[PDB]
Design a protein around this ligand. Sequence first.
Ligand SMILES: Cc1cc2nc3c(=O)[nH]c(=O)nc-3n(C[C@H](O)[C@H](O)[C@H](O)COP(=O)(O)O)c2cc1C
Length: 147
Amino acid sequence: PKALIVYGSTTGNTEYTAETIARELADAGYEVDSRDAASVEAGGLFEGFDLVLLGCSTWLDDSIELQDDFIPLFDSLEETGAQGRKVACFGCGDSSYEYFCGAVDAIEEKLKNLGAEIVQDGLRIDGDPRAARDDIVGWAHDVRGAI
Ligand SMILES: Cc1cc2nc3c(=O)[nH]c(=O)nc-3n(C[C@H](O)[C@H](O)[C@H](O)COP(=O)(O)O)c2cc1C
């Protein structure tokens, strides 16, 4: 099976999370393509992939709390080929904030409005992902089992 992983990361936490998930999928036999959201084009982005995993950090704001590199993709999510696609979301944040990992909720809700099939509840990481490595691996393991 082929999996696409797209992440938006400012300090490297969601990027570390994306690379950890990519290894667990590859070691289970999937062909994995991992890309920074700053370098992708939304048009037909998901065409040909069996599983798509989307990740991003949360930054408090009055208009949009998504990490800046992911905004352009999010705004054009309707042109990616999400209808009927198997997808799951993940993201890093901090529970001292009101909207803890709020970007994960925003992405799940829009994918749901576009007809995607959310395979598993989103992974929400508090603090340093390097200390939550077991939670990342287990989630990756559970997403493989819903495919
Ligand atoms: C100014 C600022 C605002 C932040 N706002 C939020 C927030 O609204 N919700 C949240 O869960 N985390 C918030 N964080 C925590 C970051 O999302 C967290 O540090 C995360 O690990 C960053 O991930 P990244 O390196 O992949 O960009 C904020 C951090 C800073 C510095």
